[PDB]
Design a protein around this motif. Structure first.
Motif, PDB file in Angstrom:
ATOM      1  N   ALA A   1       0.830  -1.207   0.000  1.00 40.91           N
ATOM      2  CA  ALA A   1       0.000   0.000   0.000  1.00 40.91           C
ATOM      3  C   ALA A   1       0.868   1.264   0.000  1.00 40.91           C
ATOM      4  CB  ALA A   1      -0.974  -0.005   1.184  1.00 40.91           C
ATOM      5  N   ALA A   2       1.628   1.409  -1.083  1.00 38.91           N
ATOM      6  CA  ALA A   2       2.534   2.536  -1.265  1.00 38.91           C
ATOM      7  C   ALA A   2       2.085   3.366  -2.456  1.00 38.91           C
ATOM      8  CB  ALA A   2       3.972   2.059  -1.466  1.00 38.91           C
ATOM      9  N   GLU A   3       2.046   4.685  -2.275  1.00 38.06           N
ATOM     10  CA  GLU A   3       1.675   5.611  -3.336  1.00 38.06           C
ATOM     11  C   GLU A   3       2.666   6.764  -3.374  1.00 38.06           C
ATOM     12  OE1 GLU A   3      -2.261   7.163  -3.003  1.00 38.06           O
ATOM     13  OE2 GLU A   3      -2.229   8.136  -4.971  1.00 38.06           O
ATOM     14  N   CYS A   4       3.129   7.107  -4.575  1.00 38.51           N
ATOM     15  CA  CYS A   4       4.124   8.155  -4.766  1.00 38.51           C
ATOM     16  C   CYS A   4       3.462   9.432  -5.263  1.00 38.51           C
ATOM     17  CB  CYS A   4       5.205   7.721  -5.758  1.00 38.51           C
ATOM     18  SG  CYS A   4       6.638   8.835  -5.822  1.00 38.51           S
TER      19      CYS A   4
ATOM     20  N   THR B   1       7.198  11.864  -2.205  1.00 37.40           N
ATOM     21  CA  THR B   1       6.673  11.362  -0.944  1.00 37.40           C
ATOM     22  C   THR B   1       5.869  10.099  -1.213  1.00 37.40           C
ATOM     23  OG1 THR B   1       6.506  13.648  -0.170  1.00 37.40           O
ATOM     24  CG2 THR B   1       5.434  11.947   1.151  1.00 37.40           C
ATOM     25  N   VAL B   2       6.240   9.008  -0.551  1.00 37.56           N
ATOM     26  CA  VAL B   2       5.584   7.719  -0.733  1.00 37.56           C
ATOM     27  C   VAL B   2       4.884   7.346   0.568  1.00 37.56           C
ATOM     28  CG1 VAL B   2       7.064   6.921  -2.587  1.00 37.56           C
ATOM     29  CG2 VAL B   2       7.760   6.547  -0.235  1.00 37.56           C
ATOM     30  N   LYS B   3       3.588   7.079   0.470  1.00 37.56           N
ATOM     31  CA  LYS B   3       2.801   6.574   1.587  1.00 37.56           C
ATOM     32  C   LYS B   3       2.896   5.053   1.596  1.00 37.56           C
ATOM     33  CE  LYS B   3       1.336  10.806   2.207  1.00 37.56           C
ATOM     34  NZ  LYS B   3       2.002  11.486   1.064  1.00 37.56           N
ATOM     35  N   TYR B   4       3.328   4.493   2.726  1.00 38.14           N
ATOM     36  CA  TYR B   4       3.638   3.078   2.829  1.00 38.14           C
ATOM     37  C   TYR B   4       2.974   2.452   4.048  1.00 38.14           C
ATOM     38  CZ  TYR B   4       7.041   4.549   6.355  1.00 38.14           C
ATOM     39  OH  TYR B   4       7.648   5.105   7.457  1.00 38.14           O
TER      40      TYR B   4
END
Lengths: 49, 49
Positions: free
Chosen positions: B4-7, B23-26
């Motif tokens: 569940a990673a979004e850049c 910025t990556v949400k992980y």
């Protein structure tokens, strides 16, 4: 008989003053401003919110 | 193991230096170290881990 001075007859609502002879706050025209901002003052987007 | 990673590119300027921040949400399984890398030649990463 000399008619009212320029304090009371000047167009655009100018204020007429002496020493030196000048007009003030004449609401006519516009002043074109030109800015030269050096590149140093432009910070990064991450630094500002 | 990452999940569940979004850049998001919150800032990018194509400058000679590292002119971009991603910025990556992980949602990772556990803490650790990732060998972050771009296989393509599109970007060069400042950090290898």
């Amino acid at each position: 008989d000399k008619a009212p001075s320029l304090k009371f007859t000047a167009p655009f609502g100018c204020e007429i003053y002496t020493n030196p002879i000048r007009a003030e706050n004449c609401a006519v025209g516009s002043i074109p401003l030109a800015f030269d901002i050096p590149d140093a003052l432009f910070t990064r987007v991450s630094e500002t919110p | 193991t990452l999940s569940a990673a979004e850049c998001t590119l919150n800032e990018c300027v194509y400058s000679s230096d590292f002119g971009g921040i991603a910025t990556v949400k992980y949602s990772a399984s556990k803490s650790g170290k990732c060998a972050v890398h771009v296989p393509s030649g599109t970007a060069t990463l400042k950090e290898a881990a």
